[PDB]
Amino acid sequence: NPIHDRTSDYHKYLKVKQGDSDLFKLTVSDKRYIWYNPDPKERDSYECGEIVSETSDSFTFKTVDGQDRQVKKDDANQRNPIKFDGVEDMSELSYLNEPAVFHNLRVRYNQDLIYTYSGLFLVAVNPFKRIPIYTQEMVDIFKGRRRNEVAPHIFAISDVAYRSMLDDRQNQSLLITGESGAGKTENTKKVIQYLASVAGRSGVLEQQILQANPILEAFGNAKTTRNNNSSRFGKFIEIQFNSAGFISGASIQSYLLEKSRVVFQSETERNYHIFYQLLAGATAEEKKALHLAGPESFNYLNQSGCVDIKGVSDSEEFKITRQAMDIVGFSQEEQMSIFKIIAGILHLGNIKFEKGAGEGAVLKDKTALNAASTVFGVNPSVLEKALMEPRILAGRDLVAQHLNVEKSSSSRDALVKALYGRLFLWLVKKINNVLCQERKAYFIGVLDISGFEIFKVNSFEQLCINYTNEKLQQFFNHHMFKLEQEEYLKEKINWTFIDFGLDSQATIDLIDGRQPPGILALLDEQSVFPNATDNTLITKLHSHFSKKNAKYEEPRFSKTEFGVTHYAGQVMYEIQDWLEKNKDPLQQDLELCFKDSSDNVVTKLFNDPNIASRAKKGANFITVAAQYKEQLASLMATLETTNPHFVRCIIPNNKQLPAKLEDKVVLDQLRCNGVLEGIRITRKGFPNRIIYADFVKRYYLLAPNVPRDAEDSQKATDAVLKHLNIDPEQYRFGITKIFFRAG
Ligand SMILES: COC(=O)c1cc2c3c(c(N)cc(N)c3n1)N(C)C2=O
Ligand SMILES: COC(=O)c1cc2c3c(c(N)cc(N)c3n1)N(C)C2=O
Ligand SMILES: [Mg+2]
């Protein structure tokens, strides 16, 4: 058994290395230590100082530079005995404080142990390098093990969820939190791998489930300045099981694709990988048939200054993506149409509108228009008229507009974004049709959202993302602190309620409240108001929240920005284009143009109502904000019907580098994630609890005769446990349940 064989890969890569005799000497030392700040203005940079004396209320300690300092005992962060360094479950620490928690993570991370428990949930620190802990042998090691039998691992929490699903016949969820780049998607994929392995069975479903990801990532992920493989859409993967616990299928709900990225990318960022994959990987006359050149020739790829990612071959990736499409079952014609659409988008991007004789735009060169039309299979004259002279109603009259250059470019971009988003939707739908063949008995849902992120310029997309991340942190807060203590108090176990000081509700209400209206509601209102501008909008927000809502800031340094205080920090948002992004317009004549496409996939994108149609609320189409919010509330409703398991991914630094665990970066994450509070609730509270009658059947007794049944439930439990003479401090008696602190 490799768990017990210290030469095994398990021991080498998942367990803390054996300390030496010098270490042993240090470990049995009577000396005592404190974590202190050499510079009190840098509260996250700590060193270890030896405690050399104490009074009744203070410690005096030597700093590393031999100088003595004094601190009140109430302000002291004592260092744990070094036998705890590297401990697998931090609820075991004697001293639960910030530098002590960070230090334990640091000791593990320096030995490449990225996973650490903090009571009931998992912490994961991104290594930014490959560590060989995800092989099939590692998988197999976790299968069937109680949590405490094996080292912390994403596989272990995965197994716990699976067994919880079986034992309680209750749906589960795996909620992976983290800022952008923290490791959410990699861990999500490890979860799916584990489940596909342990619950797997004909055998191609599991392969198809796994092969969904290169497709989704090629179309839905991109390089940002924070992550070379940033997910620009959120997703909820329901892994589905039959009554027997075998995988019977899976279904992916996707959220909120950053469609603006198709048409615009910041300096050093990339568009979606697929564009580069196609241009790099396509056959010699694939490229001739689609009129393609290199990325530098396309406006939608040549603006950021970056066409490459270190360590990535877009050609090789293209081969992997196509292979995935083969396994999932997209036909050759379907794939060809997909690439026609990607190529058509690049050509649309190359169209250059110019000022005509009047204010209205003209197209002097039709090479890009013609190439797009050719690959999309639409009529180029109809497309041209639809771009620069779309028809609208004025009352009931029919009026041709004549859009200027700017409006023309915007409309072309709107068309591009609509194409990309519908195509993305279609890919997801096609995928689901293949993975969903049977009605489920159970599910384990795995959530992989786009993570909390902050740039120089934060827009409506950042607000939606950061909102979602705030809702997810609140969900953790609700389950860990609020509901837990509600159980204690309903079971009257003598608990004094503790205010853990973590509540995101005010920020959430600020963003999505109804009465009084929050940001999104005022946004929606401005979005259906004919005279509205980005300026009437920002003014309206300041009018409602400035000096009124504690989580909002009207900045003095700007007239187009507003600040929201999130759990993870203040973010300033630029209001430019919010009305247009929220309304998400597309000229009907462009839809009519593409409805007439000769291409089987394109027509589906424009005629299939699940893809093409948009809901109404009154005389208006549903805004993006109201729809996403409907979607999110729906997700949270589903999660609330599940048993949640939390994984908190922690980014070590902001440089995407291995072996560089930065103090302030990590401590900021630990603080706003509520890690220490969670560890604390696990320790001060009563993690384990059981109805007075379902206890009889795991064991038997050690008592004067309470069998698998009894007339009594309360004293019938009292008696049986009592014999071990284990401390009644380690348990309590609820109206219906026995509670316990540590098993
Ligand atoms: C995620 O993207 C899409 O689903 C999507 C995108 C867009 C879209 C529109 C619509 N008028 C209607 C849709 N049903 C629709 N769907 N526009 C203007 C878009 O940019
Ligand atoms: C969900 O509850 C609410 O609707 C709600 C309640 C309140 C609220 C405020 C705001 N400044 C802004 C909101 N968006 C908001 N929303 N205040 C002061 C409230 O008491
Ligand atoms: Mg991601």
Curated annotation (Swiss-Prot):
GO terms for biological process: actin-myosin filament sliding; aggregation involved in sorocarp development; bleb assembly; cell motility; chemotaxis; contractile actin filament bundle assembly; contractile vacuole organization; cortical actin cytoskeleton organization. Residues 29-81 form the Myosin N-terminal SH3-like domain. The keyword Coiled coil applies. ATP binds at G178, E179, S180, G181, A182, G183, K184, T185. GO terms for cellular component: actomyosin; actomyosin contractile ring; apical cortex; cell cortex; cell trailing edge; cleavage furrow; cortical actin cytoskeleton; cytoplasm. The keyword Nucleotide-binding applies. It is found in: Cytoplasm, Cell cortex. The modification N6,N6-dimethyllysine is found at K129. Residues 632-654, 732-743 are annotated as: Actin-binding. Residues 85-743 form the Myosin motor domain. Keywords: Actin-binding, ATP-binding, Calmodulin-binding, Coiled coil, Cytoplasm, Methylation, Motor protein, Myosin, Nucleotide-binding, Phosphoprotein. GO terms for molecular function: 14-3-3 protein binding; actin filament binding; adenyl nucleotide binding; ATP binding; calcium-dependent ATPase activity; calmodulin binding; cytoskeletal motor activity; identical protein binding. Phosphorylation inhibits thick filament formation and reduces the actin-activated ATPase activity. Myosin is a protein that binds to actin and has ATPase activity that is activated by actin. Dictyostelium myosin-2 has no K(2)EDTA ATPase activity, perhaps correlated with the absence of a Cys at the SH-1 position (688). Myosin-2 heavy chain is two-headed. It self-assembles into filaments. Hexamer of 2 heavy chain subunits (MHC), 2 alkali light chain subunits (MLC) and 2 regulatory light chain subunits (MLC-2). Associates with elmoA. Belongs to the TRAFAC class myosin-kinesin ATPase superfamily. Myosin family. Limited proteolysis of myosin heavy chain produces 1 light meromyosin (LMM) and 1 heavy meromyosin (HMM). HMM can be further cleaved into 2 globular subfragments (S1) and 1 rod-shaped subfragment (S2). The rodlike tail sequence is highly repetitive, showing cycles of a 28-residue repeat pattern composed of 4 heptapeptides, characteristic for alpha-helical coiled coils. This is Myosin-2 heavy chain. It comes from Dictyostelium discoideum.
